[PDB]
């Protein structure tokens, strides 16, 4: 209904070199923990590293479009 500038520029940060490298390390963890459903390992570490690299790019460009 509305175009939130966050989600639009989020996709611009996701398609960067250092961000995609962190995604596949999480997807490797998403495939690691779902396979053997007998463990207690979680993929929190691989997610926060992805968010750390993504949101650093978001902060540099987001505020140029808002009032």
């Amino acid at each position: 209904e509305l175009v939130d500038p966050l989600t639009t520029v989020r996709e611009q940060c996701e398609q960067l070199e250092k961000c995609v490298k962190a995604r596949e390390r999480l997807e490797l963890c998403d495939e690691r923990v779902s396979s053997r459903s007998q463990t207690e390992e979680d993929c929190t570490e691989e997610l926060l590293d992805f968010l750390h690299a993504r949101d650093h790019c978001v902060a540099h460009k987001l505020f140029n479009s808002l009032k």
Binding site: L26, V33, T39, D42, L48, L66, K67
Partner: protein
């Protein structure tokens, strides 16, 4: 003892050393607190009169105070009663005490927001990132009902459902109420709420730097002036032989 995610630094317009708050964004941010946040969060240390000459006129702030009812009394019969708000009233508390608050929020306690920007590491960078940072739990994390995954919150499990979203309110000046906009405006207002002296200290800070840039070399020159008697003195030793 969990993993931590620290917030990045957003380029707020009040970040710079001499940079004031944006008072139009303050005005919009108050509307977010009133419409969205005030139903769960108190702000016990801000009163309607503090708005006057910051983001609303006196007449505007009076009309705003009169939109709520507050308790007063006793009257001559010893009874409490309700009257319209005035400029001197503090913002209504949503709950009489924290025990009622926990019961209304699945056992969690929404903190007072008067000082939230100053009471949390990262300030508005943290608050902005929390509100706008919700996402699905990673694989292998299953939170009990009542709690919500938020990677910026300590422990990553927060008892507050996402409170803002597109078109959560309409702004008086027509600004598109996107989630990021709403977060940005409410964070700016909360900075003002926690540090109303923000703009004035920077104005003072500028005058202090200018006066120091004058007075320091002049006072230095006075020091060197007096000391020059000593700094250029010459000694000679003439013992009898």
């Amino acid at each position: 003892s969990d993993l931590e995610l620290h917030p990045p630094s957003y380029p707020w317009s009040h970040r710079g050393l001499l940079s004031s708050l944006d008072h139009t964004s303050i005005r919009r941010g108050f509307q977010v607190y009133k419409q969205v946040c005030s139903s769960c969060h108190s702000m016990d240390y801000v009163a309607y009169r503090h708005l006057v000459g910051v983001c609303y006129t006196e007449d505007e702030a009076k009309a705003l105070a009169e939109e709520v009812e507050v308790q007063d009394g006793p009257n001559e019969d010893g009874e409490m009663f309700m009257r319209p708000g005035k400029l001197s009233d503090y913002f209504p508390k949503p709950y009489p005490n924290p025990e009622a608050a926990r019961a209304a929020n699945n056992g969690a306690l929404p903190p007072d927001l008067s000082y939230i920007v100053r009471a949390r590491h990262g300030g508005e960078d943290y608050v902005f990132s929390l509100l706008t940072g919700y996402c699905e739990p990673p694989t292998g994390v299953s939170l009990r009902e009542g709690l919500y995954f938020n990677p910026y919150f300590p422990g990553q499990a927060i008892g507050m459902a996402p409170p803002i979203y597109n078109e959560v309110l309409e702004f008086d000046d027509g600004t598109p109420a996107t989630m990021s906009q709403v977060a940005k405006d409410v964070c700016t207002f909360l900075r003002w709420a926690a540090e109303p002296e923000h703009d004035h200290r920077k104005r003072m800070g500028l005058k202090m730097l200018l006066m120091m840039g004058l007075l320091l070399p002049l006072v230095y020159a006075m020091k060197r002036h007096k000391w020059s008697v000593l700094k250029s003195r010459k000694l000679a030793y003439r013992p009898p032989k």
